[PDB]
Every structure is written in structure tokens, then in C-alpha cells.
Amino acid sequence: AKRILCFGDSLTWGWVPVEDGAPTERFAPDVRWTGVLAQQLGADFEVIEEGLSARTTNIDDPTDPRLNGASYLPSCLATHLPLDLVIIMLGTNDTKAYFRRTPLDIALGMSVLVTQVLTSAGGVGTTYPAPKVLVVSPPPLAPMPHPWFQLIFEGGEQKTTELARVYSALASFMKVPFFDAGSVISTDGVDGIHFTEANNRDLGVALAEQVRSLL
Amino acid sequence: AKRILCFGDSLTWGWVPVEDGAPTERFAPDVRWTGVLAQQLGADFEVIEEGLSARTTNIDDPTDPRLNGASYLPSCLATHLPLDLVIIMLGTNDTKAYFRRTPLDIALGMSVLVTQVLTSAGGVGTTYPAPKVLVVSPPPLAPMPHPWFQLIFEGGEQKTTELARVYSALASFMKVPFFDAGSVISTDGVDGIHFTEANNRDLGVALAEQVRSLL
Amino acid sequence: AKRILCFGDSLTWGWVPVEDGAPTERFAPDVRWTGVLAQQLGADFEVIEEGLSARTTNIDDPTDPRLNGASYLPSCLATHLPLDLVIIMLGTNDTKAYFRRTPLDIALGMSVLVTQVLTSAGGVGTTYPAPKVLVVSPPPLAPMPHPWFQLIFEGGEQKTTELARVYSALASFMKVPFFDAGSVISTDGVDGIHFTEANNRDLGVALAEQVRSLL
Amino acid sequence: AKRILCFGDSLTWGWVPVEDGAPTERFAPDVRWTGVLAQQLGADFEVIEEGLSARTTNIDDPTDPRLNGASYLPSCLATHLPLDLVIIMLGTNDTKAYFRRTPLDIALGMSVLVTQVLTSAGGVGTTYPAPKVLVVSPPPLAPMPHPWFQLIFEGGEQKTTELARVYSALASFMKVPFFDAGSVISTDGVDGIHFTEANNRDLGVALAEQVRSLL
Amino acid sequence: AKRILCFGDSLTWGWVPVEDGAPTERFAPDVRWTGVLAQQLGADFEVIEEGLSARTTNIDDPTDPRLNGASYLPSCLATHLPLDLVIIMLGTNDTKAYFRRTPLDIALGMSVLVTQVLTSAGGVGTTYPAPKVLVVSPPPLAPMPHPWFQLIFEGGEQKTTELARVYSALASFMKVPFFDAGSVISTDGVDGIHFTEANNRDLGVALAEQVRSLL
Amino acid sequence: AKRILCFGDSLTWGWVPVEDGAPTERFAPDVRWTGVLAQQLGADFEVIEEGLSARTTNIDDPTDPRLNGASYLPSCLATHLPLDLVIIMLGTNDTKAYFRRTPLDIALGMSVLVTQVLTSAGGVGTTYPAPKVLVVSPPPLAPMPHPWFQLIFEGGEQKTTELARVYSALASFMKVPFFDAGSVISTDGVDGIHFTEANNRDLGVALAEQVRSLL
Amino acid sequence: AKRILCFGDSLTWGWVPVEDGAPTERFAPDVRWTGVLAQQLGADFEVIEEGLSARTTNIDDPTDPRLNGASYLPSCLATHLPLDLVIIMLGTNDTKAYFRRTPLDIALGMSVLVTQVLTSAGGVGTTYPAPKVLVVSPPPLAPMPHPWFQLIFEGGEQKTTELARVYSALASFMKVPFFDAGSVISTDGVDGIHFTEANNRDLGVALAEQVRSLL
Amino acid sequence: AKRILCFGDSLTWGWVPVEDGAPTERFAPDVRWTGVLAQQLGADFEVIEEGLSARTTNIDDPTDPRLNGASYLPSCLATHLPLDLVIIMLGTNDTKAYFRRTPLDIALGMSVLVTQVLTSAGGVGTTYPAPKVLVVSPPPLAPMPHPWFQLIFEGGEQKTTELARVYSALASFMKVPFFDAGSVISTDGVDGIHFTEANNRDLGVALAEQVRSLL
Lengths: 215, 215, 215, 215, 215, 215, 215, 215
Description:
Chains A, B, C, D, E, F, G, H: InterPro entries: SGNH_hydro (IPR013830), SGNH_hydro_sf (IPR036514). Chains A, B, C, D, E, F, G, H: Residues 6-198 form the SGNH hydrolase-type esterase domain. Chains A, B, C, D, E, F, G, H: It comes from Mycolicibacterium smegmatis (strain ATCC 700084 / mc(2)155). The structure is a homooctamer of 215-residue chains. Chain A has helices at residues 10-13, 33-41, 69-80, 103-118, 147-152, 156-160, 163-174, 197-214, and strands at residues 2-8, 45-51, 85-89, 132-137, 178-180. Chain A has 215 residues and is an alpha/beta fold. Chain A has one domain: 3-Layer(aba) Sandwich (Rossmann fold), CATH 3.40.50.1110. Chain A has a 5-stranded parallel β-sheet with strand order 2-1-3-4-5, with helices on both faces.
């Protein structure tokens, strides 16, 4: 089978949006989009789920040492070889107010991740090739009813509206494929951040189409 | 299904032993012991493969920044919740000559990993409990025909022979389960380090029994 | 007896406000609010005083390496187990001009401390549970007659007026108790920063009621 | 009342020794030696308990970031002013095999702590003087039935036999008070490391005499 | 022959401008300005090419650890002794938006490099003198059709326009030779950043005159 | 004799202002103000000159690792015991544009140096007392004809007009002596930054009066 | 022409051995082995000289920050693309007594450099492939008359005798070419470390044959 | 007057030996050897005293951050220009048992200091040349009655006896002046470490001769 690694944040993990913000649980394996992707691709594909809630592209979060995507991705790639394609959907967490990042800064973080994929051939001690990479801008954020989410994401809705543009430009320069998740879904979870069951279905179906076309 | 994360090194990844040392490829999904484990346990269980070749317990390798297990594990656990059990088989790489580690130093690295599993409840924003842990000593190393492996593993065999004892002592102190892989297989790969198809099968069958006893 | 850890800054230590700014002394053990709290609760409770003047939530002070609350709290918690409750009143120092922090930044520092309490079960080698936590916003700052305090707290009053709102939002999200010190006292010390004897009395009496409600 | 800070490790915290090593609980407040000390001294004195299990003099423990005594002590001293005396009993953990420390190295660690006490006058913004210091060597370790404790303390029984000598030499050089806990008790806990109820009583009574002599 | 080291970025390496941004190749050795310089100077001179694409004066690039000029230059000078002149043309990369540098900041980076050249006498174990230095401001950037170049260089056109003035002031203060590449060429490459064949020729001819005037 | 340490920057070293900016020489020992101070005090005082050109209060200069005053002062104090008084005149370099410091930031740097003086009793192995400290604001800067000095000091003329205010407030709070050099001289050097012969004489005479009054 | 980068230490730079140890000069361009190599190969090849005296494989020298080969090589490769072959001769400096390195440690450093070459495709923004690599063990060291060289190289002659073996093993494992300089020359310089004119000729001739076999 | 910087440790500061080890005071200005040197040389020379008790050549002391000679020297040299000669007597503290240094390691630290002096021309913004250097081995240590000194200097008598040999070899290689203090005095202080009045006189007279011979 061809092997597809989905690297991302809570949107990849499958965070169930709740009115009280947190804590929550994971969408069922056949409901979260990575599962819908697996189902739509079929049994000659294997999907590997590497979504970590709150993960950023390449910035340390002072509240939690686990969340720097670029710190983890090289080790993850070498763990999962052989791989055919890595889907990277990140950037939503980088738009939190405390990071004070512009859309460019976020695209630069994404560029680091893209380069990690492109330079991954061989892993540790193998003959395996580098996978391809698909850069995915997350859908724009929506208004958030929970006061804490409103606070931590101040300015974030605005910055997420620019990610499709800056990620498309980056992908074009780096000669790697791009897909805008916002082109097929809006962020419809009750919290303004996460995905509904239908959001997950629609993105999984859309990404299966992208994956088939790329391989 | 109950979820089992197998955190380890090349022995968990499925490195195919070769006479010329490296490079190599991965054992087929149903051949490597993690796949044997999955097949033996059947559909009431799910296995997650997190084996990274050359990984250590908790020591940076000056040749490769990807290999410190303890740097990666917390992020891995939070990625994969919900989990029921983490099987950790590490320590072989720590016995390389260049690390100058004693069996105690290696057991201390394992202790860090055990604590990371025991303190993992909730992950990022969830209601999930911590998984159980199973500490696994790898089998003793064997004579290595390739001169580079002989060099990098000088003194290593003797240290691997002590890991069942030090890990059992650690596990008893921390009140967590222990299993010695060396109690069911010898290291029979042609390189003196990695596993044959039969080694993989025997370990997968043995670990399935261990999993059933714990979950 | 139930053990209550009071983790804070000079307002917890008991700094006596003086017209010449500094130096000063500590309020007497029966006058500072932690002592009032102890007296009001009686012998079924033991109050542990951990107030360090000038302490911040989680930011290094360039003038003094002792003042990062988050650097100290985990060691403090493991020292003081068994614990039933940790009361945290911090954020006033974070509002000093030189830190250039917003109310959100300060609430994020508070979030780090909350998580350190919530994840403290066991300490070093024990069977003890984590304590509960009570997040306390300090009262707003008041006019300051001393020229140096005027300088270092420029913009601070306005930030302290926002802390009840941002800490309440945080506590709600994290599902932990919140209390606003500003709901029972104003900052009445002559320096515009610290507490009078009556401020200490009133806060100690109010907090005893909070403690009894939680334990 | 005169204020006495007891800075130490699990022997100050009051670890209850057990046959199975860990986990355990704390001796009751009236049983641990810091409580005995307080009772023996009476109302003219106040005892502050700052014992952290596994704490070293001044060395980072790779397994736990909380354990470097010298990292914490300056903040602790400024927290607890006004102080009349600091009793420091540390060095047992420094004798663990993995630290590879000699008795001299351990005494040098103690020297750092002594200097932190001697240089602590004023704290943050106060008129208080520096407290006196009392350097205390812990009793020699004893045979340990638990295999993990045997492993981690290999060579440590021997090193602990030398601490009275090297600490006495240090304290003489630094012109500060010294007391050997081994002059009054042997390590009689079932694990070979920690104190019995009677050890706690005997040491508390002995230290009360030392405090009265100094204050 | 007198030896001339040309230390720079892609403008010194000889990056061929392309409409799709990247990837590209190097201008031929007789076409890039360092080769024109060598040809124009003739046999009494020797040119050493040390241009690294994307290199900055003295600032780490978060996307690529190879790019800090000041990290490399001292090792490079000691490698190439004996030297008569070092031509330094850098600053263009420093004007990328993500570095948030002012013309002054960039001139201060150039100052570090100048001092590295001035203090280079002897290298490792030699009797050789320091070379002279020639500070060169790059020409102003121009409009960039590629959306990714436009993004990463936002604000850069404006900052590059100031480099001749700030570098001239620096060089005057430091009492070292200065030349403005913008005095003889405009940035005519199709991407708005790199040099055409004619730009290379004109700059090489001009720099040959500067070299003869200094050596 | 009483021992007076003069800790400062180029204005303490005795930089001779020159129209061409740099390089320069030092004023003669009887002309620089530290020499005038010595003469005025007489031979029952010993003046120790510790002026380092370009030194800041407590901020690293990216162009030169020698220039952080606070990195050097504790070692300097311990070198020169016994000492009666330390005169600190710093802050001019902190006003350089690249540091992006406010007058408050610079006063906070000064506070670190004051504390280092006040906590210096005993040095290494001695019985000697801490010296007193005299905080001195440098005179305001003047117009600078040299384009490099104009560049690096942009915004600094205005900041230096504020140092007397912020340093007087700091000194008042810390209960240490203050003197404004601007109260007796203007910056009359041809470069707008450094002192003329008369500026040196007038400041030395004034500081001798201050020293006598303080001891 | 095909481009050959010679990455090395003083043996590549062309250090002229002298009886007084240091300082010295460089062998003439037609005498040092890199120039003999160029002459032997002729105009279809281009030799790039990157030898830095005292350079180590991958270890910082406490006396000189310029000397870590692995710190410099990635930047050097990207500078000099396009490249066809990198010849690496290093390890002599790693045998200095102060580094306390074994032959394995030195071969591990070499491994880092080999990996840097193998992973160098593309450089910064190019279409160029990775060059091939040739690992070269230096000849064994000889007796040294200068007392300082005797001191700093104590144990080094014995370690250098082992480098051909360990480098051969490493090269075999990594599936890259290997050549032992010691197979064609002995270290005949008067200082017991550096090369004579004839040593340079013989190695240049031998390495030209090696190059012709690879390209 | 020519300016002579005496850079050293307690032997340069003028530590008065005492039977109780520490604390002590400084020898009077005309009794410590730097003052003897000044009196002997007379008014055409100016001696600058830069002796810091416990200073090492270039190693951090874990007990005291002030003691790394190499961290301080470059800033000191630039402070004290113009300079004619730097006399460096260091290495005694590096022989303390806890540093685990060999004589070679200490000579390498001295080499760093020598290079700092040799490369000091110009300082910050000046026209001044580098001073000359004189490398001075301290005399051999002697038997020590104080138990703390016996402990911390274990192995030091042997190592200090080697310093004249290794420093002479170093100075010869580096082509700089060397003088052995042990050629004119023995360490006659009652503590076995520091100098008597006569030791000071004898060394000061000897060094005056060395200074005149070099200048």
C-alpha cells in the first residue's frame, strides 16, 4: 500500500468542539477526517495519524514544551518510512495572540516543515525515498463564544484568512503541491475553532481526491 | 478496540538484518513483530508503531538529532490518546561505545520514559486517562560480522546482558509491569543486532500474551 | 489537618507599605493575611506561606534571578506534599512597565502555574493526590506617591484592572476555582501597591470562607 | 519568635521507609524531626520545613528538574525572611552512583549553599539581616534490601561515611557551625536510607540543643 | 599574485534569475562578476569565490543554519591566508521582512565582518598579515513578480536603498575602503533580486578598477 | 588611603573627541577626570580607573562581547577590595538606537550594577565591607557631526536628557547617593559625545567634592 | 570542468614544517598536494582548496572557535556548488591529548562530515546533485622534536595508526569510497606532523589516480 | 610612564596567609609584590593591579561565577589601554582537585590568555598597539596544614611543579617571554599556598628586572 502521513494539530487529531471550551474527546476513527481519508482512498493506502492538539509550525509555546512541530517532524518522518506523501495542515495555533506572528512568519514555519519532508530520504539507515508533501492551509477561524478562546485567539481570525494566500505562494516557490482546506469547508464547530462531523467528512473526501491525483 | 503504542528503536521499526550492515529496508507489515502482535491480538486491539531506528532512551546522539527517545515521547503520547498501553523496548542503542553508559545510566533513561507515560493523563485538553506501561528489555546482542557495527557496539553485548536485571529492578520500584524479550528470543539476525522473521514472530506472540494479561 | 499552600508575591509575603518605597519589613504573623487565614481556619488546617516579593507568574526578571514563579512552583509543590489546596495570587509584578506584558500574557503565565498544580500528584515517590487550586486575581493598583514606583508601574494599574476578567476566563476554561481579591478589598497601602492591616484582615477572612467551600 | 528554616531532602521531608522501596507517605507532623524540633523548642521559635525528596546540593538530576538545591535556595531564603538560622542537611542524594561525585565534590556543593545563606541579607527590599547557618552531615547509609536502591546508591554507603569529615573541614574553613547527624543516629529505616520514628525523635532533640546554643 | 577573497551571498555566488523564483543554477565562471573581475585583473591577481546564497551579515536565519556570514568568515579567512584584499558584499538578505532589521542593524552586522577581516593577521600559526577590506553596498532591490519573493522581501527595496549611505558612514568611521555597487548597476534580473549577465560584467569591470586602486 | 573605583565607559576612560569619529587616544592621566579627581582628593585617596569605551549598563552589544558592564563588575569589585566607594557613570551607550532601550530600561540596568556593589562585601575570602556607591547620570548628548555617530545615536540625545530623572528616582528608592554630571558640565566635545579638557576638569573637581562629602 | 573540493586541516592547507614549531608559511601553490592534484588532473578538473590549520572533524577546540569542521562544511558545500567530489582528510587534530578522543570517536566525527556531503544536494535553491565523497585517513604521526608539539599530541601517534582501519570500516558501512594517505606516504616533516615537498607530490599524484577512478 | 598590567589570582592580589585558612586581608600596598614591583621600577612605570583571588586561567568554577580569567581579560585589556606589558601569573587555582585538570589543560588555558593579549591592539576605537606579554608560572605549592586546603588542593603540589615546564614549552612555541616565579621564591606562606612578605619582595624585585629587560 501507499503510505500517507497526516501531520497536524487538533484539527488533524480530531478535537470534538464543546461549548465549555475544554476538556474534550476525540472524534471516532471513522468520523475524524483522517479516517474519512482512509476510507475514501481504500485499502491500498495506509493513513498514519500524527495530529497533536495545540501544535504550531515551528515555534515553542511557553505553556507546553510538546507543541513545536518542527522539533518533532524529522523524528516522525524517520519513524514512519517508507512514506509516499505527507499532508501538513498547521498554522492555526501560530495565530494565537501571544505568538505575535504575521502570516509571513507562519508561512516561514511551514517552509521549515516542507524542507524537513523534502530532505527526509533515507531516514536512519535505509534506501527509502523522500515522500512528497502537500501543504494545506487550514480553514479560516470563526467567532468563538468561549471567553478564553476569544482571548487567546485575538487577531487570529484575521491572520487565518491570509494563510491560503501565503501558503500558496510558498508552495509555488518550493514546487510542491498546495490545497486550501478553506476552499471546501468553513470552520463550523460550536467553539469557532474545530470541525463538525460534516466538516470532517467534507475535508476527508476532498483530501482523498487530492492524494489520488498526486500519486 | 484497546490501543497499544509500541515505542522503540530499530527492533520495533523492523530493521531487516543485512550482511553489509546498512542500508536496509523494513520488514513487511505482517512480519515485523508489531504486525505479528496486531495479528495475534485481533480486532479487539489496535497497535500503533512508533519505532525509530537508532533511538536511545534519553541521550542525544552526536551524529543525529532525531534519536533522543525522551525528547519525543511526551509529544507522541499526547498525539495518540486515547491509549490503553505503552510498550517500551529501548536501551540497545544506549550500549554503543560512544555513549560510555552503564546499565544503571540506561535504566535511569528508561525511568524517565516510564514517568512520561505515567504522567500523561489528559494530554492536551482531553478527559482521557494515562495508559499502562510495559517495560521491555531487549534481548542481548550477539557477535557482529560487520567491522563498523563491531566498533560502534564495543562493550555493548555485555551491557545488554544486564538490562533484564536493571529494568526488572526499576519496574519493581516503580510498580509497573516488566517483560524480558530475551526470555523468548535470542538476537539471531545475521548482523548480531537485529531480528530474523522467526525472532519477530516469537516476540509478537509472546507480547500478545503479555498484553492480554494487562488489559 | 488539611494543608493549604499560599503561593504569591509581596502581597502574600506581607510587605508593609512605606512612604519611602523600600526598604521595609514583613507584617506580623497574626496580621498578614496568610496568618489571618490560618487563625480563621483553626487547627484543622495548616497554612504554608510561600510569598516572594517581586515574584512574577512565569517571566524572568532581568534584575533578579529569583522571581520566576513557574521556575519555583513545581519544586515547592513536591516539597510540601501532602497538599489539599494551592491558592495562587500573582500578576501584579508582571504589570511592571519593563515586562511589556498584556493581561493575556499574564493569564498565560497563570495558566502555567495552574497546570503545575494540577499535574503535581505523587511528587517525588509518594502516594498523594494533586491538590485543588484557587486562582486569585490581585486587587487593582492605586495611585503611587513614590517616583520610582510610578516609573516601574507605568501602565500597570490599567493592566491590573483586567486581571479579574482574564483570570476568570482562564479558570472557567481550565475548570478550576476562581476568586477576585478586588471583590473584597481595594489596594489601600500608602504606596499604592501593598496592603494595609485592614486589607490583610478582610482578605484573610474572605479566603477562609473560600477554603471551607472547596475542602 | 526566632525562625529556623530546615533545608534538606527526603530525610528532612520525613520519608517513611518501606520494604518495597516506593511509593510512600510522609511521617506525621509531630513525628518527623522538623516537628520534633518545633515541639522541643516551643513557642519562642518557629520551624519552616523545606525538605524535598531526592534533592542534591547543587547538581541537576537528569531524571527530574526539581532537585538542584542551589537552584532553589536563594528564592526560598528571600521567601522566608525574617530568618535567624538555616539548617542544611544534604548530600545523601549526591552519593548516588550516577552522579559520579566524590565527597569533595559534595562538600563544594554544600559550600555554595552556605554562601547563599551568608549572602542573603535584605532579601527583596527588606531591612532583615542574614540568618546564621548550621551545616549538617547526614548519617551514613546502611545496607539496602531493595534492588533498585542498591543499584542507584552503589558506592554511596562509602561516600556518606566521609561527609562528616569533609563538611567539618568546610565549615571550619568558612567559620560556620557544623553538626554531624551521624553523631546521634544511625540510618535505621528498613530501606537502609531513611529514618525510623526513633531516629526522627533523636535527631530533633539533638538539633533543638544545637539551635538553642546558636540563638 | 595578489589574492582577493570575494565574500558574499547569491549575488557573489552568481545566482541566475528565473521567473519561477527557484530552483536555478550558477552563472558560468567567465560570466559571474567574480570571474569578470579575475579576467579583467589578469595574472598578477587571483580571485577566491566565497558567495553563499541567502547569506546574511551576522544574523541566523530560522530556515537554514548555514547563512550567518559572521559565523563563517573567521574560519574562511584563516583557510585562505595569505590574502591581500577581502571584498564584502552583503546585506540584501538582511532586508527580508522576517528579520525586522533596520539599515543601521545591517550596517552593524557589516561592522562585525569588517572587524573580523581587520583582526585576521596570522590566522592559525602563520606569519601573514591581515588583508585590506573593501565594503560594498549591494544595489537596491527592484520589483519582484514572484509572490513568494514579494512576501519575503516586503520592505526590502526601501532598506536596500539606504545601504550605500549607511555603509559609507560605517566605512568612513572605521577608516576602510567603500564602494557602492548601485553606483554602477541597477538590479536588472527578471526576479527583481539577482543580476543579469550585463550586471555581472559591469560590476566586475568596476570592481577591478577598485582593486587596482587598493593593491 | 581610601579607595575609589570609577566604573564607566569611554567618558570614564578618557576618550579624546575627534572630528573623524575614531580612532583616537586617551587623555593624559592628569587631564582625564579620574586623574583630576585623584589630584583634588589628594594622596590619602587612591583612584582606580575602570572605564571601558562603549560599555553598557547590562546589555550585550552584538558587535563586541566585552561591553556588558554587569557581566564584568562583580569580578572587578572582588579584584579591587578593599574599596570605599564605587562611582558608576554609565548609560550613554545604552541610548544607542540599536539597543531599543527606554530610559527606564537603562535605569533598571543601573539598578543591577548598584546591587552588585551593595552585595560585594567579603569578595573572595575576605573580611572587607561593601563599598558605598554613587550613581552618576552622564551629561546629555549634543549634536553629532559625524554621520556614523549620528546613525548609531539616533534618539539618544533625547534619552540622555531623561537619565538624571530616572537615575535620581532609582537612587532615592535604593537609598544610595546620586549625582548628575549634567548639572556641572555639558557635552562639549567636537563629536557631540565626549568630553573636552575643561569638561574633564570640571567633572573631576565636582566629583571630588561629592566623594569627600560621602566618606 | 569537474569540481573537486579538498576539505581538510593544515595538511590540506599546506603548512610548512619548521623546527621552531610555529609560526610558519604556506607551501607554494604548485608544491602543496592540492596543487599537485590540480596539475596531475589538468584542465578538465578544478580543485578547490579548503584546508584550515588545526581543524578537527566535529569537536570544538577550547583555544580557537574556528576549528570545528562539521560547523563549517555544510556552508562550504553550498558555497561551492556545483561539485563532483569532496575529498575529506581530517582526524589528525582530533588526536591531540586534550580532546581525549578514541579512534572511534574520531571516525564518528568523520561520519558526520560524510553525511553532510551525502545530504548536500540542491544547496540553497539549486538544481545541482550531491557530489561524491572520498574519505581519506591521514598518515600516522611521527616523533616530534618540539616540546609543545610533544605535549599537545601525547597519545596521538598511536591513535593516528588506527585511523585507516576505523575510516575503512566506516566508509564500507556508509558505502562510500575510502583511501589511506598512509599507504603512499609517511609523515616526513621535521616536526613529526606536517608534510615535506615530496610528501605533497606523492599524495597529489596518488589522489589524482583516485579522482580519475571516481569521475 | 609605561603601563604594566599584572593579571593574576590571589598571589597577585596579595592574600595574607593565615593558619585558619580564611578569611584574610590584603597585604599593604608597598608589601604585596605588585607594589614592590612599582617601587622598584619607579616613576617611569605605572603598575595596574588585576589580581582576583581564586581566578583560574579559563575554566568556570562551579562555586563562583567571577573566576574565569579568560572571560574577563579581553574587557580588562581594552579598559587599560594604553599598555606596554601584561604579566600573567595564573594556574594555581586550576590545580584544585575538583577541576580534574592536567598541566597540559592548564597550559592551554594560559595559551588562550596569551592570545588575548597578542590580539588586543586597538581595543575599542584606539590607535594603540598590543602590549607585550610575560607568561609567569607560579611557584610550586607546599604542604598545607588546613584540612580544607589539603582537600581542595589534592594533586596540586604535583601539578604546580609541572607548570614551569609546560608554560616554558608553550611560551617557546608562541614566541613570547617566560619567567618562572619558582626560580626565585618558594611558597613559604604558613598555609602552603600564599606568599610571605619576603616572597613578595623577592618576586617584585625579580620581576622589575624582567620588565626592564622587555621594555
